[model samples]
Each structure stands twice: as C-alpha cells, then as structure tokens.
Target: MNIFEMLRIDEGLRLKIYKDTEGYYTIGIGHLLTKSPSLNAAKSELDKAIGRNTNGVITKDEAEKLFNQDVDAAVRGILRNAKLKPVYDSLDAVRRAAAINMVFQMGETGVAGFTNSLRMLQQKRWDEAAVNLAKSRWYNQTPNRAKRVITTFRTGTWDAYKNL
Candidate 1:
C-alpha cells in the first residue's frame, strides 16, 4: 500500500471536524488547528464544511500538501509582516527558526500585536524579548509551548530543537 493510504489506515479519517487527543480541532489525517492571518476572522471553513456536508473531503495527500503550503506561507508572512529589516536578516538560524515558529503559532498579525516584544526583537534585546514573550497573553494561552520558545528566546541557544 502507498504511504498515504497506509497513514490513512493507521491515523483514520474523520469527515467532520473533531477535537484531537489534545483538544485541538483536527480533520482528515492529523492537520493541526490553523486559521487566517487576521485575528478576528470568521469561523474556519472546515467547520462550515462539516456543517455543509462538503465536497471537500480531502485525502491525506491533499491534507498534507495543504499543510506544507500553509507552513511556507506562515514563514513568509512572518518575514514580511514583522518587517525585521535589520535584525531578522542578522539572526542566526536558530533564532530565525524560533522566530518563524513563534510567528506560526501566534499568526502574523497576532505576533505583530506584541509591540514591546517585536521592538526588543528588532533591537536584539534577547533577554527583554524573552521576558516580554512570557508576559504576552499568548504565553498565558499556551504555556507548554511558550515554555520552550521563551527559553530559546532567552538563552540564544535553541533549547528543544537544538539542530533546527
């Protein structure tokens, strides 16, 4: 059997949006929860599809490809919206990867909301960025996640995913 079919057999498919083991909405194979760049966009089309009985019951290949493209867009959006003209280009790959992840989790406009944090990032104020990262409401919303990202921001070493 092909890998995608094998993955489907293993992971199982859900036509409707349902909470995964972690309480995040998931569909198809295991796509994580994500939404538009806007902070206050309407409900996701996934939910609407579930309600509407979709022509959009995508396969694992389709889902995985979409997820990959979404991730690329997130990184590019982060690079663009942060406007890190000075600091982003100079940051080591570890820091750059960390920054990309933070933007991914927070979403482009959401990360942009962190005025002080972004300012610190621009000024290369690592410590302050770490502190401000923790102070963010996003931190409160996502503790376990921020724990690692904040640590990376503070230490200048990529703590969790050290290599990349």
Candidate 2:
C-alpha cells in the first residue's frame, strides 16, 4: 500500500488532521497525521535540513516537532537499521524524496541512521546500498507504515510516498 493508504486518512480525516496541525511546521505527529504537507514540500524541506544540519540525521523529538509520531518513527527506524543502509545510499533525488516522505509519515528513529550507509554511498558502494534498503521496512505492529515505505521503494515514484 501507498503512504496515504497506510496513513488511512479519508477525506474527512485528512481535512481534520490538516486543520488540527496546521500551525506547527517542523516535524512530528502533527505534521504526519494532521498538517500533512505535500510530498514535494516535505522532500525539499528535509533535503535542506539534511544538507544544512551536517549532523544529517534528526532526532525523534525533532521529527515530532516537524511531522507526526508515526512519521518520526518511520524515519528513525529506517536510519537505525544497518541492513537498510544500502537502500538509502542508492536513493536518487526522487527516491530520497520518497524516503523522506515515508520518514515524515513514520519517524526519524524509525529508519536507521545513515552514518555508515552514507559513508558507503560516498564511496559509491552499490551492493551495500541495496542490502541496506531491503532491510529498512516497517515493524510488525505498523503494517500501514511498513507498506507505505516498501511501496515507495518498489514504485520508484513520488506518489508512493506523497500526501494525497
């Protein structure tokens, strides 16, 4: 399933969530469940954050401040899982955008940190990248969350991870 499908925000829920979390514009449960930003906007902002922060990886609280809890978790999980490093490393701009969107939907800690993976990417390691990406799916309790990220990775399209 797609990110939207995972989120399961019907028209009413989407409007309610967006309205409830419109004011805060950082990252957290609010951003993910309530004020769901467009995929393009999320990607642009996250890319800038990663580039500017130098630290690259964001904390769970930071993600909560910017997006919803689930999104924050998704991101954190992806970054934390060493096995998923390859996928993150191999990600191009579009794929990166989708990845970020999934993280925004889940959480920062949800994805394993890309420290080692980023180093591999810097070294142009393709095999390692693929390995890491494969291992970055969601946990058992969060079926929707996992589906969204996996679908995005599979589709190689922004729509897979974008807010509908």
lDDT (CA) per prediction: 0.58, 0.46
Q: Roughly what TM-score does model 2 have, to 2 decimal places?
A: 0.34
Q: Candidate 2's error at 52, in angstroms?
A: 30
Regions of candidate 1 where Cα sits further than 4 Å from its true position: 1-16, 19-60, 82-86, 162-164
Measured on C-alpha atoms, candidate 1 has an lDDT of 0.58
Q: What would the per-residue lDDT of candidate 2 be over residues 42-138, giving only the tens digit for each residue? A: 4455556435432223555454334344545665666676665456666665555556564553445554454554454445564564455445433
lDDT of 1 by residue, 60-117 (tens): 5556664555556666775565365345676766667667666545566667677777
Candidate 1 residue pairs in backbone clash: none
- Tell me the TM-score of each prediction against the true structure: 0.63, 0.34
Q: How many residue pairs clash in each candidate?
A: 0, 58
